[PDB]
Each structure stands twice: as C-alpha cells, then as structure tokens.
Design a binder for this molecule. Sequence first.
Ligand SMILES: N[C@@H](CCC(=O)N[C@@H](CS)C(=O)NCC(=O)O)C(=O)O
Ligand SMILES: N[C@@H](CCC(=O)N[C@@H](CS)C(=O)NCC(=O)O)C(=O)O
Lengths: 220, 218
Amino acid sequence: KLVLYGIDPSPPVRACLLTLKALNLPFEYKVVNLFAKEHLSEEYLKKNPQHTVPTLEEDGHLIWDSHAIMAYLVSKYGKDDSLYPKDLLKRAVVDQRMYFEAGVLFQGGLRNITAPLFFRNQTQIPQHQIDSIVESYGFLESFLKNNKYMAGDHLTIADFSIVTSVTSLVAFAEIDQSKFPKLSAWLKSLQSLPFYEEANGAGAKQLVAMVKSKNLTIVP
Amino acid sequence: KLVLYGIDPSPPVRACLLTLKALNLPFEYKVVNLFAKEHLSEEYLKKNPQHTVPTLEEDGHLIWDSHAIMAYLVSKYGKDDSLYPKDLLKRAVVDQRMYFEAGVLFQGGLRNITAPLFFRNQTQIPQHQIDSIVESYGFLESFLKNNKYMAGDHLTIADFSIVTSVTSLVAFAEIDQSKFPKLSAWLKSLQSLPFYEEANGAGAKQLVAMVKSKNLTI
Ligand SMILES: N[C@@H](CCC(=O)N[C@@H](CS)C(=O)NCC(=O)O)C(=O)O
Ligand SMILES: N[C@@H](CCC(=O)N[C@@H](CS)C(=O)NCC(=O)O)C(=O)O
C-alpha cells in the first residue's frame, strides 16, 4: 500500500500527486504540517533525516525527494515507460529537466524567497530575484522550442515536476504570454489533464494565497 | 566519441571528470571559460540554451546537467552497474542524493554565495548562509549513518556529485571533524582515489584560490 507524506501547498508533494494520478495508483496520504513543525518530530526524522516533504513509504521502505520518487514510481508501476523513457538519450533529457526544476526553479527561484518570507518575514524581494525567475521562464520557453512537452513529444514526469514550481513562481512573477507563448500554451495543456486540479491545482491555489497574503514588495 | 565542455573550478564539471575517469573513458575536454563569457556565444547557446557547463557531446548528440550526464555515462558505458545501480530502490537513494546535491548543496549552499560574489562583488557573507552550509554537512553526516558511501556500501555517482560540492563549500565553511566525523572519513575515502587530483582536486583548489583572492568576510 503506497503512503505519501506531505502537504498540498508544497510543489514537490504536488509533483508526486500528479504522478500517482497519472499512473492510476491508489495511495494513502499522511499530512505533515510544516507550519506546526511536524516534519521536525523525532518520528518524522527517523523516516527522513532531511526533514522534507514528500516522503514515500512502500512495504516499509522509505524514499524521499519528489524526483527520485517520481522516477521510482514510473519505473516500478508504469505499464510502459512513457512517463520516463528507458531510451538513455531520452532519459537524459527528462533527468536534466528535473534537475533544472530542483535547482533553478525550486531552490533558486521559489525556496530562495519563501524560506526567508515565512520564516523571517522577509517581505522585500530584490528585483534581481524576480529577474532570475523571468530568466528561468525564458529557459523553459527554450526547452519547448522544438517540443510539445518539456522533454520531448510526450508527457513525462519532467512536465509534472516543472509545472508544480511554475504554478508557484507565478505568485512572484506572472508569465508574460507575449514573451513566453509556448510556456503559456504548455501550462494550459497541463491544466487540461483530468487529474490536474486534484493533484496540483488545489495546492497551488493555497500556496499562491499564502504568498499574496504576505503583501510583498519588489525592490528595484 | 565523447567531448566534455567545462572549466575545472565548476563542481558539476568535476563530477563528470570523476565519472569519466572512474569508467576509464577517453574524451576530449573542451574548455569553456565562464569568466571570459565563452558560454554566452551563439555557438555554445546552440549546444546548451541554459548556458551552463558541463555539456556532453556524444557522436554529435548533446546532453547537459552533470547528474543526467553521469547517469547516462554509467548506463551506456559501465561494465557493470556499481556506479549507478539498476535496482530501483538502490537507484532511488542515488537519485535522491544527487537531487540533494543539485538543490541544497550546489544552488542553496554554493551558488547562493558565488553568484553574488562573482556577479555583484559581495564579499560579506551573512552568518546564516554559513549556518545553512553547516546544517547541510549535518544532513550529509546523517546520510552516512549506516553506510560508508553516500548512497550505500559502495562508491556511486552520488559520491562524485556530492564531493564536488563539499570541496567547494569548504572554501566558505570548514568541516569540523568533531561534529562531522563520518563526513570527514568519507571525504578521505574520496581524496584517495588514484584519479581524484586530476578530476576534482585541481579545480577544487583553483576555486578556493579564486575565493581567497576576493578577501571574504562573514
Ligand atoms: N528536492 C526535494 C525538496 C523538498 C523540499 O524542500 N520540500 C519543502 C516543502 S516545499 C520542505 O519540506 N521544507 C521543510 C524543510 O526543508 O525543513 C524534493 O524534490 O522533494
Ligand atoms: N545543474 C547543473 C548546474 C550547472 C551550473 O550551474 N554550472 C555553472 C558553473 S559551476 C555554470 O555553468 N554557470 C554559468 C551560468 O549559469 O551562466 C549541473 O549539474 O550541470
């Protein structure tokens, strides 16, 4: 019986949700309230010493990091390899896109703001940070230059990982459709998935709301 | 025919160099000098629109990101899977450690200080960024609780990835051996591979010297 530990404002938890729904997998969900420091409990640290969400539990085994989890799920459960191609050159693109999300989008763009924001009430955001988010939208627009989805011609876990961060980063910088038409189209396409709302949309809305309620300032 | 594009001070370049050497693969090393903005030319942007190093070229096909390159090299060229185990659960640990390196160590620890430093000449490092680095050492210490290497009982590309970052982070935050004994032992187990200096040491030192010449303060 799969168990996912998380809370839905979290982008990587949402990426796992997307992927479990895409694989038509049932699972138990255990909420870990980061705002009440539940991830810092002795019990949770034994599951995941990095004290992050998501964690996946399967027959006693604990796996963390959304990208590891997503790859594991497709590899283990996928009817075929559509969501995570076995072809090594294809896999290298999916992998690259996910490492891009981990580093550039999630740490560099999002957590770089949200950690001081919710922890230290740092409500002033330097323009150079917003510039970096917009630079990353540009990189995503480049990724899509000759492909319908982030890593090629079909939907993969790279799309799921990337969309979770993109739909959070828009709390700080909107995506200019005139600059980033492909990124814009791609997002609407992901938004069309039957499981999109339940896996990503719901949590994204709650995170965007939390951010908006903090009344941020961009400093030139 | 393998070509690696990079510069030695870059940790993810060094991770690829460590892996190439471990697999004993011939390659051409094309220097792309970030300080001369060689990564921003039309030619390089065609290879990698992210304008990062490393980039790997294999018979004309281009791939980038150290972690993706390392997984690709072991998968394609490894005589066996020891450096990147095929077992899904074992792979999941290797994968997680590499994503940790990408986000927490490299972006959150290293590039967080080196971008302001090299782009904005910010030589004053907020004490809390050093703390965060030390916290990351602590996470690495935990990863080593029941295992001699980062992802289990043998050397993997997770070790290569993490060493490159750790050796760069040392430039800002010394490792206290009384707090992180397992990490300290682990780092010696890497510093000892016969190909360590040529693949990681040289460029790690160069980055240290660049960092030192900037005369930092906390
Ligand atoms: N690379 C990890 C990132 C996980 C992460 O940083 N999650 C945040 C929530 S969005 C978290 O658990 N923060 C609490 C903490 O780090 O203490 C993944 O992809 O799962
Ligand atoms: N996730 C990438 C990170 C690559 C990266 O950020 N490399 C730096 C050098 S250490 C770089 O190319 N900086 C130049 C730039 O980003 O413009 C990887 O693992 O290869």
